[PDB]
């Protein structure tokens, strides 16, 4: 087990966990939580970054001296990948956009890059590979996002047969694009919902739950070549979920029905932003797609994790979206939403 | 007297080089490994043995008070030279 | 012996009262303060043109640590561990063993520069003038790890600064 | 390309503006703050470089952690760091702020301010001289000169 | 006789009465602490934590130790009411960033050498 | 005495090698004074002296435009000064390294390097000692 | 006037010590043995209390 | 003797011994011992019940006039049945003299507050409580002065670890500063410095 990679200590900041993890996409939403959970217990974390180094400062205090290393990398360059995965025994892939840029489409970020990472990790001798997919990934999906996700997981399994594939469903957290996205809709006055959100079921999952599931999957020997689905404990109709979101933020809820073609046109209109789009046609599709039910897959409870209900962690995200007059309202004030549990 | 390991890592004067399978090598990627090139053992090995005509010699490292504490070295054995325990200089009595 | 600071009485003659009234109505001490500031305005400033000009220092100045050599190139350090014992911040970590030629030398000599207080106790305790505080003070870094010096870093510092260090010691060794 | 040249020149302009106007928060903790004052003194005159102290964190660009950070003080330092609008920079000055220094093994001392906030420049010394702090500030300026935010955005 | 000077209470009954008064004060304060500090926990969680902290020292039978514990509890309550504590201090009672350490023999044997 | 200061300014302009040199020293150092040259580095730094200035301005260095690997036309720092001129410049001695050269040693660096933090040449700390505990190597052959 | 308590002294709840470092620790009470390298006996006069030795490991940085 | 040895002052020694005898005679109910050190410092040992009467007498008596409380602190000696030694340092401006009053207490026995005698005693008693856990009865506002909010234990006790039990760091998941059990990358290195040979025969103890 390579004595230098033998666990030591109490399990804290100055301890040794025996994990040397290269975390692709560590500068995003899930990446910071994953790096934080790796660094709490004394793991060596390699952070490949393409952005400006100023955008990686928040990751520095997450590890002891020498336990977090930053190197530049290029998604379209295999030498960068091999350079950042030579000395690792765990490789985690969290790379992904929610929109298509002029340099990287969905096939570039969900198919080509994951496949290259998996192939390089396999030829480099990496023992464990964690690949993130979507619960709604489907080759026959109306979303290019999910089709690319399905093709990407097929090719990752082809290139790294012992990889672990995780399929979370609409992760919510402080820096998410799920609760914040719905909360952001108040500016346009009314909330446009296709079919008033009455024909969509969502099963959102907590960010800490997903990060702890990834951490436990690294440490679990049976989770080597399995496929997991990370979902929350409750299923909600989209209308009720958005109504609860607006109720927690104490904002007036004015839902109106909008036709699919018109709201797709709105998404296309928003897609022309050279910066981060406020919404896209792909987001239009994914918001109004019901979350699949996959009872044949192991879940968070198979990794020792009890799923955190949204009603316990919604306030820490939506209190920022309140006005001054409702900032101090307590968590148990907002009458949790009705749940369609089978 | 620097020397490289079969991996390409420079071996320091203390002889420590990471094993090819050691993950701690990653700290030198995109960076360098600090190694001092003036190996003191080779440098002191180049100094000639001083010939002196007494059984006991004194060494303070040169420079008076800028050297080391002054010690006295016995030179009775012709089999080996008298080495200073502080500086490493060598002394011997005339033979041959 | 002592003196009083606020035990003077103003004279009540018409001359003094009129002078005080003129001071009150015409703001004479405020004009005096303005005059002092105006006087300072036309003086030459005390600013130096750093980094082209530098503040004066002394041979006794304590800067970055360095490890020195004998004129033959042999290390002066003999692993006596006096500096480690005396170090008030426990910033020095030393390990030693007999060398391949039987010499008493270190295998580890680390100075945690973020633990160090730059007191110079270590260079006082050294009996062979092996560890010194150099004249350099411009060695700021971008990461914490770069301030954890090992034996190679200190030996390189000595090799790089010996020309100045020997001259500084030559000027002060008769005070020590 | 034309766009590459345009974004490079825009980066140059923004970086010059940001490094030529660096306003540190009026914030000090211990012995080091005295050397900070002396670096503000007429001999060195940081104001001639464009460096002006401002009390409000909302109006400050840099935080200089000059002194020991204790456990009781860490939440306040984190609070005032957070309230700083971006871009913001942190300079760690002195052994106490760098790694705990001479109170490293104390029960009430944080072993380095990098456990609380990200650090851009570490200034060694106990205390660092005012000239050493000026060198650290100029190094921070040189680091700001190397930022390529708009190039990275364009290449996305 | 053991000749010991008291602090506040002559015996365990007055100590119990002081404990009950301190518990009442903390129970009243908890909702105000939840509102003022903008805590993400509920009032039930805070009151359960107060009960847990009180029951932590249930085995004490010395009235002087009980009096000192009540004094410390009143100091903590005075810190909390005056907002001398911050949110970090209040949340330190919950240990939300520490991993759950197992208690069984086999897990301790696997992880390390601590008994 | 106004014409005197104007003529001294004109002399400063003419003493820097012309108008282009005047603007070069104005934009490279924010200082246009003319002093007596003391010496020059092997790296290109020029050292001047003017004893009529007060303590602190009587010695200064004009930095080179190209040290070991980088362009230093604008990016200069105090770590570019070699140790001997470092000793002279900080007034630790009254003697320049020209009249009083340092002592030559075979182990002294022949090429001075500046602060290399933030560069691929930066110092990376590592343990310098050997592995302490040796593990038992199992035999490579079957046992039955 | 005094209260006459009748229970053995216990101050564990007032020392602020974590539960792990009260019930799992073993302290040794002894007079230290003379360092055999020397003949002085001035270090063998008093009684000492020390705790049981716990795990020490190498730091990945600096060893 | 002469150049390197500290000179003596017999006049101050006799004056302090006489005043110690005076104070012991005036307050036999509380005074247990009076000592004069060889560098001319007067120490008076009292019973804990006499904290208020003795300090009041030393402050208000015409021949004492110790109107200034220089310092008040505690010393922890775990080997004693009464753990904590309470030290009062007083200064007389009328007579240009200093005096030290010492008493004792354990972890559970309160000591009377001296704020009625000296207003300076407020923060000193607060610091003694914070650092040693000695409770002062009738203190107008007794609470921690030096330690962090919610800090457990009394650091200045000899059995408190030097680095404590908890350390602080910022945690990004909870977006706040958290407290966790201490782990040190480098452990503080304990040094055994005491020589096995006796240094001062004048302080040798009986071999029991
Ligand atoms: C408005 C009036 C300006 C008149 C003026 O500048 O003369 C000031 C001149 C200043 O004398 P000083 O600074 O006491 O003398 C110091 C040496 O001459 C010190 O002289 P120096 O060796 O520093 O000379 C450097 C030289 C070169 O300096 C520069 O070119 C940089 C500044 C340019 C400013 C324009 O400065 C000048 O000679 C130009 C002076 C301003 C020109 C405008 O004397 C006066 O004219 C007093 C006028 C009454 C003032 C009330
Ligand atoms: C979480 O992510 C997101 C962001 O990032 C933080 C955003 O900024 C963002 C957009 C930010 C909003 C505040 C935009 C509000 C401005 C609107 C365009 C105003 C609506 C129309 C105005 C022009 C007012 C005039 C009314 C009509 C006559 C037209 C969104 C939607 C988002 O979702
Ligand atoms: C018109 C209203 C709208 C626009 C608002 C902005 C107004 C125009 C901006 C003014 C530009 C002036 C900045 C140029 C100053 C640079 C000075 C020089 O020193 O820079 C050097 C090199 O220059 C920089 O690399 C780049 C500066 C120029 C940037 C490119 C020009 C872009 C102009 C585009 C205009 C468009 C404005 C927006 C329109 C909507 C780097 O040297 P430096 O390290 O500092 O100094 C070392 C310190 N020493 C000397 C003491 C040792
Ligand atoms: C023959 C018939 C003539 C008719 C009558 C004409 C004669 C008038 C003679 C008296 C005129 C006096 C005018 C002054 C008015 C105010 C003076 C005054 O007393 O104010 C001061 C306070 O005023 C100040 O001190 C000013 C404070 C702010 C200072 C700011 C800078 C100072 C000004 C710099 C220079 C001023 C230049 C002004 C003109 C600029 C050009 C437009 C009083 O304050 P105290 O001393 O505290 O006494 C109060 C209790 N007895
Ligand atoms: N968020 C959710 O609700 C769900 C997320 N997932 C998956 O989880 C993963 C990450 O989640 P999240 O963290 O929210 O996504 P983020 O966008 O928040 O993080 C994206 C990361 O991917 C990197 N990245 C994206 N495109 C590229 C590229 N072309 N080249 C290099 N690096 C790139 C980004 O680097 P930079 O910062 O430089 O862009 C960033 O570090 C994604 O794969 C996503 O599909 C799965 C199910 C639901
Ligand atoms: C305008 C003059 C320059 C002021 C520079 C800002 C000083 C910031 C440090 C804060 C501080 C101040 C103000 C201060 O006055 C002081 O002495 C009591 C300190 O102790 C070291 C300080 O830390
Ligand atoms: S200068 Fe002082 S603190 Fe620094 S290493 Fe030497 S003895 Fe230790
Ligand atoms: S540097 Fe000097 S004092 Fe320290 S171990 Fe070496 S010889 Fe001894
Ligand atoms: S580093 Fe030194 S000078 Fe600075 S605050 Fe700490 S002890 Fe004081
Ligand atoms: Zn010698």
UniProtKB/TrEMBL annotation, chain A:
Its main location: mitochondrion. Residues 22-225 form the NAD-dependent epimerase/dehydratase domain. One of its GO terms (cellular component) is mitochondrial matrix. NADPH binds at residues 25, 27, 29-30, 50, 95-97, 145, 149. The keyword Transport applies. It is found in: Mitochondrion matrix. It holds the Pfam family Epimerase. Its cofactor is FAD. Gene3D superfamilies: NAD(P)-binding Rossmann-like Domain. The keyword Electron transport applies. InterPro entries: ComplexI_NDUFA9_subunit (IPR051207), Epimerase_deHydtase (IPR001509), NAD(P)-bd_dom_sf (IPR036291). Belongs to the complex I NDUFA9 subunit family. This is NADH dehydrogenase [ubiquinone] 1 alpha subcomplex subunit 9, mitochondrial. It comes from Sus scrofa (Pig).
Automatic annotation (TrEMBL), chain D:
[4Fe-4S] cluster binds at residues 31-32, 96, 126. Keywords: 4Fe-4S, Iron, Iron-sulfur, Metal-binding, NAD, Nucleotide-binding. It catalyses: a ubiquinone + NADH + 5 H(+)(in) = a ubiquinol + NAD(+) + 4 H(+)(out). Transmembrane segments: none annotated. GO terms for molecular function: 4 iron, 4 sulfur cluster binding; metal ion binding; NADH dehydrogenase (ubiquinone) activity; quinone binding. Its cofactor is [4Fe-4S] cluster. NADPH binds at residue 156. Belongs to the complex I 20 kDa subunit family. Core subunit of respiratory chain NADH dehydrogenase (Complex I) which is composed of 45 different subunits. This is a component of the iron-sulfur (IP) fragment of the enzyme. Core subunit of the mitochondrial membrane respiratory chain NADH dehydrogenase (Complex I) which catalyzes electron transfer from NADH through the respiratory chain, using ubiquinone as an electron acceptor. Essential for the catalytic activity of complex I. This is NADH dehydrogenase [ubiquinone] iron-sulfur protein 7, mitochondrial. The lineage of its organism: Eukaryota, Metazoa, Chordata, Craniata, Vertebrata.
From TrEMBL, chain E:
InterPro entries: Complex1_LYR_dom, Complex1_LYR_NDUFA6_LYRM6, NADH_Ub_cplx-1_asu_su-6. Belongs to the complex I LYR family. This is NADH dehydrogenase [ubiquinone] 1 alpha subcomplex subunit 6. One of its GO terms (cellular component) is mitochondrial inner membrane. It comes from Sus scrofa. It is found in: Mitochondrion inner membrane. PANTHER family: NADH DEHYDROGENASE [UBIQUINONE] 1 ALPHA SUBCOMPLEX SUBUNIT 6, NADH-UBIQUINONE OXIDOREDUCTASE B14 SUBUNIT. Transmembrane segments: none annotated. Its main location: mitochondrion. Accessory subunit of the mitochondrial membrane respiratory chain NADH dehydrogenase (Complex I), that is believed to be not involved in catalysis. Required for proper complex I assembly. Complex I functions in the transfer of electrons from NADH to the respiratory chain. The immediate electron acceptor for the enzyme is believed to be ubiquinone. Accessory subunit of the mitochondrial membrane respiratory chain NADH dehydrogenase (Complex I), that is believed to be not involved in catalysis. Complex I functions in the transfer of electrons from NADH to the respiratory chain. The immediate electron acceptor for the enzyme is believed to be ubiquinone. Keywords: Electron transport, Membrane, Mitochondrion, Mitochondrion inner membrane, Respiratory chain, Transport, Ubiquinone.
UniProtKB/TrEMBL annotation, chain F:
GO terms for cellular component: mitochondrial inner membrane; respiratory chain complex I. InterPro entries: NDUFA12. Belongs to the complex I NDUFA12 subunit family. Accessory subunit of the mitochondrial membrane respiratory chain NADH dehydrogenase (Complex I), that is believed not to be involved in catalysis. Complex I functions in the transfer of electrons from NADH to the respiratory chain. The immediate electron acceptor for the enzyme is believed to be ubiquinone. The gene is NDUFA12. It is found in: Mitochondrion inner membrane. Complex I is composed of 45 different subunits. It comes from Sus scrofa. Keywords: Electron transport, Membrane, Mitochondrion, Mitochondrion inner membrane, Respiratory chain, Transport, Ubiquinone. PANTHER family: NADH DEHYDROGENASE [UBIQUINONE] 1 ALPHA SUBCOMPLEX SUBUNIT 12, NADH-UBIQUINONE OXIDOREDUCTASE SUBUNIT B17.2. This is NADH dehydrogenase [ubiquinone] 1 alpha subcomplex subunit 12. Its main location: mitochondrion. It is a peripheral membrane protein. The keyword Transport applies.
């Amino acid at each position: 087990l390579h004595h230098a990679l033998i666990p030591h200590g109490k399990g804290g900041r100055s301890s040794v966990s025996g994990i040397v993890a290269t975390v692709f996409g560590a500068t995003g939403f899930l990446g910071r939580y994953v790096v934080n959970h790796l660094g709490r217990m004394g793991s060596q974390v390699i952070v490949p970054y393409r952005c400006e180094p100023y955008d990686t400062m928040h990751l520095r205090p997450m590890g002891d001296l020498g336990q977090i290393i930053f190197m530049e990398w290029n998604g379209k360059d295999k030498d960068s990948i091999r350079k950042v995965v030579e000395h690792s025994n765990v490789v985690i892939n969290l790379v992904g956009r929610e929109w298509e840029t002029k340099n990287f489409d969905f096939e570039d970020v969900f198919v080509k890059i994951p496949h290259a990472i998996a192939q390089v990790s396999k030829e480099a001798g990496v023992e464990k590979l964690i690949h993130i997919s979507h619960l709604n990934a489907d080759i026959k999906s109306p979303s290019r996002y999910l089709r690319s996700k399905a093709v990407g997981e097929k090719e990752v399994r082809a290139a790294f047969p012992e990889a672990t594939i995780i399929k979370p469903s609409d992760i919510f957290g402080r820096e998410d694009r799920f609760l914040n996205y719905f909360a952001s809709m108040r500016w346009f006055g009314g909330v446009p919902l296709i079919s008033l959100g009455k024909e969509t079921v969502k099963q959102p999952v907590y960010i800490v739950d997903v990060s702890k599931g990834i951490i436990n999957a690294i440490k679990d020997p049976d989770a080597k070549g399995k496929t997991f689905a990370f979902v929350g404990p409750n299923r909600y109709l989209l209308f009720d979920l958005v109504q609860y979101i607006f109720a927690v933020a104490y904002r007036p809820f004015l839902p109106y029905p909008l036709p699919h073609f018109a709201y797709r046109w709105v998404g296309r209109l928003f897609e022309v932003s050279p910066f981060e789009p406020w919404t896209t046609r792909d987001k239009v599709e994914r918001v109004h797609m019901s979350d699949m039910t996959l009872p044949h897959l192991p879940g968070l409870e198979d990794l020792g994790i009890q799923a955190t209900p949204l009603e316990l962690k919604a306030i820490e995200v939506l209190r920022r979206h309140r006005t001054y007059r409702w900032l101090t309202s307590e968590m148990e004030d907002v009458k949790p939403a009705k749940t369609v549990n089978i | 007297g620097v020397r490289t390991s079969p991996t390409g890592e420079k071996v320091t004067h203390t002889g420590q080089a990471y094993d090819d399978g050691d993950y701690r090598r990653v700290r030198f990627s995109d960076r360098q490994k600090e190694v001092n090139e003036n190996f003191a053992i080779d440098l002191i090995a180049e100094q000639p043995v001083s010939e002196v005509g007494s059984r006991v010699i004194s060494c303070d490292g040169g420079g008076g008070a800028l050297g080391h504490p002054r010690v006295y070295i016995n030179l009775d054995k012709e089999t080996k030279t008298g080495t200073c325990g502080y500086c490493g200089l060598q002394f011997r009595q005339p033979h041959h | 012996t002592y003196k009083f600071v606020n035990m003077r009485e103003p004279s009540m003659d018409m001359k003094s009262v009129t002078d005080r009234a003129a001071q009150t109505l015409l703001w004479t001490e405020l004009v005096r303060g303005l005059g002092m500031t105006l006087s300072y305005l036309f003086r030459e400033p005390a600013t130096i043109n750093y980094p082209f000009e530098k503040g004066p220092l002394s041979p006794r100045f304590r800067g970055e640590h360095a490890l020195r050599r004998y004129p033959s190139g042999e290390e002066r350090c003999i692993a006596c561990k006096l500096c480690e014992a005396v170090c008030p911040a426990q910033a020095i970590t030393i390990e030693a063993e007999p060398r391949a030629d039987g010499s008493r030398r270190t295998t580890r000599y680390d100075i945690d520069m973020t633990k160090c207080i730059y007191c110079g106790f270590c260079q006082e305790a050294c009996p062979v003038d092996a560890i010194v505080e150099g004249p350099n003070f411009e060695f700021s870094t971008e990461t914490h790890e770069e301030l954890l010096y090992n034996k190679e870093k200190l030996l390189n510092n000595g090799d790089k600064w010996e020309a100045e260090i020997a001259a500084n010691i030559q000027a002060d060794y008769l005070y020590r | 390309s034309r766009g590459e040249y345009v974004v490079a020149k825009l980066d140059d302009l923004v970086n010059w503006a940001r490094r030529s106007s660096l306003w540190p928060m009026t914030f000090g903790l211990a012995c080091c703050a005295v050397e900070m004052m002396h670096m503000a003194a007429p001999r060195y005159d940081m104001d001639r470089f464009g460096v002006v102290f401002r009390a409000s964190p909302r109006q400050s660009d840099v935080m200089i952690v000059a002194g020991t950070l204790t456990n009781k003080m860490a939440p306040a330092l984190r609070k005032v760091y957070d309230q700083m609008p971006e871009p913001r920079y942190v300079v760690s000055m002195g052994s106490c702020a760098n790694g705990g220094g001479y109170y490293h093994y104390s029960y009430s001392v944080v072993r380095g301010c990098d456990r609380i906030v990200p650090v851009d420049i570490y200034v060694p010394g106990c205390p660092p001289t005012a000239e050493a702090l000026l060198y650290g500030i100029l190094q921070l300026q040189r680091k700001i000169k190397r930022e390529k935010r708009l190039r990275i955005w364009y290449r996305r | 006789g053991t000749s010991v000077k008291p602090i506040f209470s002559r015996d365990m009954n007055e100590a119990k009465r002081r404990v009950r008064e301190l518990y009442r004060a903390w129970y009243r304060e908890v909702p105000n602490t939840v509102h003022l500090f903008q805590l993400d926990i509920s009032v039930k969680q805070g009151r359960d934590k107060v009960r847990e902290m009180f029951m932590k020292n249930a085995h004490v039978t010395d009235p002087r130790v009980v009096d000192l514990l009540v004094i410390k509890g009143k100091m903590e309550l005075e810190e909390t009411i005056n907002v001398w504590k911050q949110r970090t201090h209040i949340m330190r009672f919950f240990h939300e960033t520490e991993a759950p350490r197992p208690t069984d023999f086999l897990s301790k044997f696997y992880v390390g050498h601590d008994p | 005495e106004l014409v005197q200061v104007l003529r001294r300014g004109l002399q400063q302009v003419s003493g820097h090698g012309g108008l282009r040199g005047y603007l070069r020293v104005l934009f490279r150092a924010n200082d246009v004074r003319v002093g007596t040259l003391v010496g020059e580095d092997k790296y290109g730094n020029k050292y001047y002296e003017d004893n009529k200035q007060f303590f602190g301005r009587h010695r200064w260095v004009i930095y080179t435009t190209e040290m070991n690997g980088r362009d230093t036309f604008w990016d200069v720092d105090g770590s570019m000064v070699p140790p001997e001129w470092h000793r002279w410049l900080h007034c630790m001695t009254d003697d320049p390294p020209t009249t009083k050269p340092p002592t030559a040693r075979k182990y002294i660096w022949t090429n001075h390097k500046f602060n290399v933090s933030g560069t691929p040449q930066q110092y990376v700390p590592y343990s310098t000692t050997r592995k302490k505990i040796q593990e038992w190597v199992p035999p490579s052959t079957p046992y039955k | 006037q005094l209260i006459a308590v009748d229970e053995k002294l216990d101050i564990t709840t007032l020392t602020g010590v974590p539960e792990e470092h009260i019930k799992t620790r073993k302290v040794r009470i002894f007079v230290p043995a003379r360092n055999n390298m020397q003949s002085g006996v001035n270090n063998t006069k008093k009684w000492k209390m020390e705790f049981d030795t716990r795990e020490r490991w190498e730091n990945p940085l600096m060893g | 003797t002469r150049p390197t040895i500290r000179p003596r002052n017999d006049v101050v020694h006799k004056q302090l011994s006489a005043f110690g005898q005076y104070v012991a005679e005036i307050l036999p109910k509380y005074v247990q011992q009076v000592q004069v050190s060889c560098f001319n410092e007067l120490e008076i040992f009292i019973h804990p019940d006499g904290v208020i009467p003795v300090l009041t007498f030393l402050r208000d008596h015409t021949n004492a006039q110790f109107k200034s409380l220089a310092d008040l602190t505690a010393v922890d000696v775990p080997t004693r049945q009464n753990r904590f030694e309470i030290v009062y340092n007083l200064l007389s401006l009328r007579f240009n003299s200093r005096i030290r009053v010492k008493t004792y207490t354990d972890e559970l026995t309160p000591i009377e507050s001296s704020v009625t005698v000296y207003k300076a005693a407020n923060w000193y008693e607060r610091e003694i409580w914070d650092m040693f856990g000695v409770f002062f009865a009738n203190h107008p506002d007794l609470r921690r002065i030096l330690t962090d909010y919610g800090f457990e234990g009394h650091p200045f006790r000899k059995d408190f670890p030097l680095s404590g039990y908890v350390e602080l760091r910022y945690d990004d998941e909870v977006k706040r500063v958290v407290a966790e059990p201490v782990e040190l990358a480098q452990e503080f290195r304990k040094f055994d410095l005491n020589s096995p040979w006796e240094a001062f025969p004048a302080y040798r103890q009986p071999p029991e």
